[PDB]
Design a protein around this ligand. Sequence first.
Ligand SMILES: *[C@@H]1O[C@H](CO)[C@@H](O)[C@H](O)[C@H]1NC(C)=O
Ligand SMILES: O=C(CO)CO
Ligand SMILES: [Cl-]
Ligand SMILES: [Cl-]
Ligand SMILES: [Cu+2]
Length: 228
Amino acid sequence: HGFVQNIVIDGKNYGGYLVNQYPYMSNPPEVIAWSTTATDLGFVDGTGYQTPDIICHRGAKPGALTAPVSPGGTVELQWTPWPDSHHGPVINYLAPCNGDCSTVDKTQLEFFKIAESGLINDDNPPGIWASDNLIAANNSWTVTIPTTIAPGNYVLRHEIIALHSAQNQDGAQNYPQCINLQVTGGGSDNPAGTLGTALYHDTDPGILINIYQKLSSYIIPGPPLYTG
Ligand SMILES: *[C@@H]1O[C@H](CO)[C@@H](O)[C@H](O)[C@H]1NC(C)=O
Ligand SMILES: O=C(CO)CO
Ligand SMILES: [Cl-]
Ligand SMILES: [Cl-]
Ligand SMILES: [Cu+2]
């Protein structure tokens, strides 16, 4: 359980969608982060992978604001403290807005994977995962926006999948957090995109999995990494 509380770009903080404060207001502020209804700080499980909730979390609506990123620039997402028990991959996707991200129909977004990290070491099962790397970085993740993609407005969909209950059907816990970016630079690629509702299925080999046994490999879920 947790959420993204802050985003660092170009030497400043963009405040996140503080899901334990803003939902409790009739007049919340404008941010780059999407609003959600996930006030339990929880997850979308396999029962929701083909509902709109998987796209940018439960009841999500676009952020009003969009943050500019320098060409090949970094986006640092700062989480609430991630529990060590919640072992799993950290995955990052972009989808183009083809206009202002604030007015997009989330159900039409087509995501391409720009980064993935999974099982890092398995010397002592359940081992050390991308989520443990995030904890070791003081609950921060660094995303480099590719230089080879077409610039424009994009949704960044940044996600932890916790696997501590993933040996039973619909036990994996997805934690997607979306923010609006203005990608800048000289790139041209328009990568093949996947609908949010086709990213994951509740029987995928990296989703329905017992992490407590020795693993020889881990197949990171979702469509193939874009490498440009
Ligand atoms: C994170 O930073 C704090 C100090 O602000 C430090 O005490 C702590 O050990 C750091 N955590 C890790 C895992 O490096
Ligand atoms: O999430 C869990 C308890 O915190 C296990 O399913
Ligand atoms: Cl609730
Ligand atoms: Cl922690
Ligand atoms: Cu949790």
